[PDB]
Design a protein around this ligand. Structure first.
Ligand SMILES: *Cc1cc2c(cc1C)nc1c(=O)[nH]c(=O)nc-1n2C[C@H](O)[C@H](O)[C@H](O)COP(=O)(O)OP(=O)(O)OC[C@H]1O[C@@H](n2cnc3c(N)ncnc32)[C@H](O)[C@@H]1O
Ligand SMILES: *Cc1cc2c(cc1C)nc1c(=O)[nH]c(=O)nc-1n2C[C@H](O)[C@H](O)[C@H](O)COP(=O)(O)OP(=O)(O)OC[C@H]1O[C@@H](n2cnc3c(N)ncnc32)[C@H](O)[C@@H]1O
Ligand SMILES: [Mg+2]
Ligand SMILES: [Mg+2]
Ligand SMILES: [Mg+2]
Lengths: 448, 450
């Protein structure tokens, strides 16, 4: 019987396991995949790292910043300079020093007032208990889309805001409750923190990619602790401990920390079954929909044209793109996303069909040299059986106030982690780390 | 390991309908059921010398499949009691007695309610029963909650309130939880708002003598000996070019094709190899089951009948929104049947049976009167706590789900085919829709085998 069994070796499970080990307790980590990192995933292609999962850290994300500094992983800045390209519907592409300058003063004022309005709501939502917001009932009953419509902002501003919503939530404004979106904005420290590159969540990358940071963290565990390729099928508990069922047999422990996405936590055979409010909460926490891609070129040829590599095309299937080129300056990479409905449509198509869509958008925005592609690498996170959607869960109307209170409450000897349980930077690697710290502290207090 | 033509996962009305059709066509079939019984979301226990339907209990006009099955397997109906005054307790004032609930409304209020129901029906009729995502205004209707749509109509507070009781009694979910497209499809599927809400002429018209689970047991008895395997949950479904391997705790079954006839949330929990395609997996994540606690309060006699009361109370601002006289034809014991729905179900499900009883008796004392405290017994079931259901009556879809994920609802994945009331075109959410789905999935499998 080990003291603690952790299910899942993403940042949340690995943080929890390391904290349990450092306190002197025995720990086993059972991970379904043949690797650690979870929703972070890095592969070597073209002599450089390709982050198919989470890749950015930014100011305010102090847990992941501290971890990278502890484990010796350096950052490099997301490129910010050069003209952005904005394309509306059947128009011509417009170069602007920033995306914002493609809109009128009146449109930018309306967008800033709308974001400010959402921030002032967000500040009222308690980070550990969004269901305790004074207006929780009203705000849980309303979609974000209905709230945006009630502000009376013009179509164009609502459209621009929708690009930002889909980029942050991997879901449309109709899928999300206002209370969910408000909590998420509060959790990040504001709308600028979510959407800015400089000063926000897209500010910095990790030299070598993010999966190797998760691997350095896993290397702080003793040999024998990590069990890869070992999906957890069942989790039983009684008065003396827990029993984890895998295909290859059973693990006995005193307490468990389940650190997987909510939809996957619900699929484990729990004995006794989970209490109904918790089971139904997991039924109301669907993962987002995103296909993440990197377009590889021999060089970042757009830079010589004075272009950033960022394109904003609200009527195309892809979201905002980014210059993904490493510090070496080759290969040239354009990074982007299919989000929400567009990701579900794209996920039903082949890689080559997705490639063709992306290259056509880039040819029309960055220029005809976009067609001379060396490689196209993507990942539909909804097709990953051990994730079933990025970036993370969202809650539809009515879920936070009725089912949400079951989010973090331990069920006997079974404690919960994962970025969806974080108070701050929920949905991000930083929040995953928070959740693993919190769950470990719960378990260590319970064993004592 | 055993080899059969078809394995059916689940012995609810959908699974059993499918298995019987496959058997009667001459194919070998096994039915693997998790529970120690058949009937699934229908469940009957004997108490106080009569049947207690803890799950689905009513059938109505227009539900032709369940009516044909009951007739075929020799299960008689009895009518839901209709006579006596209903009691309506609004958010303000004393309880009001009326021969029908609608008489508790003002004329302005009743006109507004019928105009709201008519407007919903006009949208509903435009929603194709086989493909709600092909509605002309599908994107707009899928992007709006039913509640937002109601708010836009400008009806009076008492009208929104009584409409909300009906919404929660039909969907086991609040109007904020449901997309307008989902609600409109459900109304079309049933044949209109009256079909869903009426007793005479609607879904609550008739009961089955002896309860519903015996009907499922008679349908199971049409299978050959050894076909039904109870207390055998399916954990895994692996498939290749030639068949499917079904994994249970102790063994495996090999089949040419499978029909999975379980609630959507539980279908997604089976270990699929290869993994399910992403649209389907994410659809199941967007098909949460409802929240209901169904109860029966037992009295020695239906004493309310002697006071000229029907036993029905309607309370928009109470944890129990609606009740019915559940007394059997013999006339004893007296039964008051009702529901905690939606948020009230989740709140109630976190409390004990005795705590729920005391909430029910509190509401009944204030509406039917003092004799409501003279309880012989109280029997209830939180369907959200049932590990092999995880919520009644069935799934609903939140905004944005039907248009983006919905198209994956019925499409087979290789040799794995889908049944269940949630896949029915007509009377989806009901026993009648379960039977439809089972007939459809059996015909699909038989066509695909040859
Ligand atoms: C997918 C993605 C995510 C992402 C993003 C882009 C994409 C395409 N961009 C981000 C970014 O730039 N910066 C950032 O901070 N976050 C970004 N995100 C989100 C981020 O990746 C996640 O918030 C974070 O990685 C989540 O960590 P957490 O530890 O909570 O969850 P996980 O990584 O999913 O780990 C769960 C592990 O559990 C294993 N698993 C699942 N089920 C089982 C069972 N049954 N048995 C055993 N193991 C299981 C998974 O394999 C996984 O390793
Ligand atoms: C619960 C409920 C339902 C109900 C209602 C009131 C309540 C509280 N009132 C109704 C009514 O008066 N009239 C009516 O027509 N319907 C009413 N409903 C809904 C109705 O009961 C359902 O629509 C219908 O019974 C659904 O049938 P279906 O066959 O589609 O589904 P099921 O009954 O859930 O059966 C599924 C079976 O699968 C088993 N199971 C689940 N998971 C597994 C696995 N992994 N392996 C093996 N078997 C599995 C279940 O145990 C169940 O038997
Ligand atoms: Mg810039
Ligand atoms: Mg009547
Ligand atoms: Mg019609």
């Amino acid at each position: 019987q080990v003291d603690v069994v952790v299910v899942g070796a993403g940042f949340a499970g690995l943080t929890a396991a390391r904290a349990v080990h450092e306190a002197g307790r025995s720990v086993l980590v059972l991970e379904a995949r043949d690797r650690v990192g979870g929703r972070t995933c890095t592969e070597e292609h073209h002599g450089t790292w390709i982050d198919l999962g989470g890749q950015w850290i930014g100011p305010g994300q102090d847990r992941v910043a501290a971890l990278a500094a502890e484990l010796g992983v350096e950052t490099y800045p997301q490129p910010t300079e050069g003209d952005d390209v904005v394309l509306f519907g059947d128009g011509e592409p417009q170069r602007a020093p920033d995306v914002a300058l493609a809109f009128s003063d009146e449109e930018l004022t309306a967008y800033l007032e709308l974001a400010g309005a959402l921030e002032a709501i967000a500040e009222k939502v308690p980070l550990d208990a969004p269901w305790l917001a004074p207006e929780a009932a009203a705000w849980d009953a309303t979609t974000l889309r209905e709230w945006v419509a009630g502000t009376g902002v013009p179509d164009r501003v609502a459209g621009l805001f929708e690009v930002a919503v889909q980029a942050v939530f991997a879901a449309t404004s109709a899928q999300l409750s206002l209370l969910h979106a408000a909590h998420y904005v509060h959790s990040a420290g504001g709308w600028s923190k979510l959407t800015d590159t400089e000063g926000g969540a897209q500010q910095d990358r990790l030299v070598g990619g993010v999966q190797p940071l998760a691997e350095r963290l896993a290397a702080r565990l003793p040999d024998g602790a990590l069990r890869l390729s070992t999906p957890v099928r069942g989790l039983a508990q009684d008065g003396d401990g827990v029993t984890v069922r895998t295909a290859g047999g059973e693990v006995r422990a005193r307490r468990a920390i389940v650190a997987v996405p909510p939809t996957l936590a619900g699929r484990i055979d729990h004995d006794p079954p989970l209490p109904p409010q918790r089971d139904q909460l997991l039924q109301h926490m669907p993962q987002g929909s995103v296909v993440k891609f990197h377009v590889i070129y021999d060089e970042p040829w757009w830079r010589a044209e004075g272009l950033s590599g960022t394109v904003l095309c609200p009527d195309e299937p892809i979201g905002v793109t980014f210059d993904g080129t490493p510090p070496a300056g080759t290969p040239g990479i354009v990074t982007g996303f299919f989000e929400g409905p567009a990701a579900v449509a794209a996920g039903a198509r082949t890689r080559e069909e997705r490639r063709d869509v992306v290259v056509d958008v880039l040819a029309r925005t960055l220029g005809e040299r976009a067609r001379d592609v060396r490689d196209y690498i993507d990942r539909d996170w909804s097709a990953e059986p051990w994730t079933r959607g990025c970036y993370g869960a969202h809650l539809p109307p009515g879920a936070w106030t009725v089912y949400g209170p079951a989010l973090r409450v331990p069920v006997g000897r079974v404690h919960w982690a994962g970025t969806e349980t974080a108070e701050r930077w929920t949905g991000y690697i930083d929040g995953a780390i928070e959740s693993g710290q919190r769950a470990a502290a719960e378990v260590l207090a319970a064993l004592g």
